[PDB]
Amino acid sequence: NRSQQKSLGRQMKILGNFQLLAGRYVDALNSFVDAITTLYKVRDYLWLGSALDGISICFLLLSYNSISIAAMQSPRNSIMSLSAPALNIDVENINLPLLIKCISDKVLYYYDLSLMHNSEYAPQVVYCEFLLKTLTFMTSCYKSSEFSKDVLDNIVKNQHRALSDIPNSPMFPRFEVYFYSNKLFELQLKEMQVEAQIKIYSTMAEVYRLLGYKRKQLFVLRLLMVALLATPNKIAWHPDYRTLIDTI
Amino acid sequence: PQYFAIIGKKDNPVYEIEFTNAENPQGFPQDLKELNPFILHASLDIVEDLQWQINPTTDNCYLGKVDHFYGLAITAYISYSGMKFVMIHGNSANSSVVIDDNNMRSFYQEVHELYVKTLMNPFYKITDPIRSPAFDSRVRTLARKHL
Amino acid sequence: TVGPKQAITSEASTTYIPSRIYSESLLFKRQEASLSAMAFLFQEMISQLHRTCKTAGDFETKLSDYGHNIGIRLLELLNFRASSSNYITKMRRRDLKILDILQFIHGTLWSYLFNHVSDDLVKSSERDNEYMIVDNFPTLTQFIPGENVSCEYFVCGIIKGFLFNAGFPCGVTAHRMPQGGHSQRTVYLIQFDRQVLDREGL
Predict the structure, then answer these.
(1) How far apart are CA C48 and CA A62, in angstroms?
(2) Domain that holds residue B103
(3) H-assigned helices in C26-178
(4) Residue B41 to residue A222, Cβ atoms within 8 A
(5) Cα(A145)–Cα(A9) distance, rounded to whole angstroms?
(6) How many domains does chain B have?
(7) Which residues of A touch B47 (CB under 8 A)?
């Protein structure tokens, strides 16, 4: 079918752009390899990776849920990483949303408020992707849910979101809105591997500390304590627990 | 089930109650021991943040549903001395305080009248709990007749 | 045995209507007295606080505590009966700006304790963080002779505990400026702290 060849290209394109997106290290400084999927450009590894991810996200949005949301998140991450380098990819990166504003709706030109709209639309596309089977790959065909991989998207959404609130009297994002946009995950949280559950409560404590909410911190460290106590395996002493009990 | 508490100035409690329906008599099953004071003390802070906001997130005494967590909404009232009348509502489905929002504003005003009536005793200091047998009947007849 | 701090009592709703034990009332019922019967009790404050005090300053700041324990009662009463139990009472504006509670104290606290509204409310123009409140006749200290103003402070503790329980940590100090034919004019300066001062800026 045409949808079969489009599904083959949807499988091909995002992974074909993702390794070139992962071909950046310290902004690609003097790493001249054998020039087979390693270009070693001076200041255009982000630009070539952004063009690859732009073509891949355009082809996946033409092939329009899970891989579509991952493609839109890949285009958002490529635009954010290209803007993170102080380069000339501003008008090209803002006009690079030709299929991202067709499937998503960015409609902005500010300092990552366009990426805030694209991230909210990416979480909406992953929420649309939740209305499917719980795991669509081969090794993920009898996995937990989509509830173990929506959560990794929105916790790095919060990690990228709250840094816009630097304390001073200008507030880029009102102080209540990421407090609202972190309480959306009241997923059951019952079963997964534990070292995700230490990290989510630790960075949720750190985002509450940098916002300045000194009792929601006590709530999430109490959730960290309850999750640490009831684990069935055995753990060892580490001096992280020393300062954790000291701050609580 | 319903949880109601009067939180003082230093966050020390002065009145602490739950009241619940007779269908589930042992109310709040494995939350009353271990989450129900933590969500109260954690979500004092957004009530404290809303005490200096002119318009919310021209009365500034009643406050709406200020937090919603596992489908439990809390409602708040900041009195003139600063004793805050925060109360957690629990149900089976998604509970609505909007069906009682016109109603239980006259439950917060009719418990604030009882707090003013127990403030005027000169033997009653601040930062000590209400050890009053009259206060329990005066709050639970109000909870029974007006919910 | 209703709220112990050992536990939260779990009790089911819709029980019986119990007996009625003590019922009070809260409206004003404007009942008068004689100023001699006030001034006798004010001099019997001072005739014991002169006795159990060693220096001047601790006499100042424990004559102030009696006013503190009238101010923290009166703040909850006066707004609640000015916004008007079973009378379907509403709410006021729960004021939260420093020259919106000074207008309330200036026009309502002094019209409650005393018959008249206090006359003037003066900002300190040449600096910031001093706010004068004056009258022309302190009617409680008016039977004290001399000039030393320690016996003033029972009224100024009424001011301070009004604001300390209102979320506005301040400190009052009374002085005497005999302006004109009002020989007892008796300014109080309310002097807010530094840590409040940023908050009304933001």
Answers:
(1) 91
(2) 1-147
(3) 35-49, 56-82, 98-104, 110-113, 153-164
(4) no
(5) 25
(6) 1
(7) none
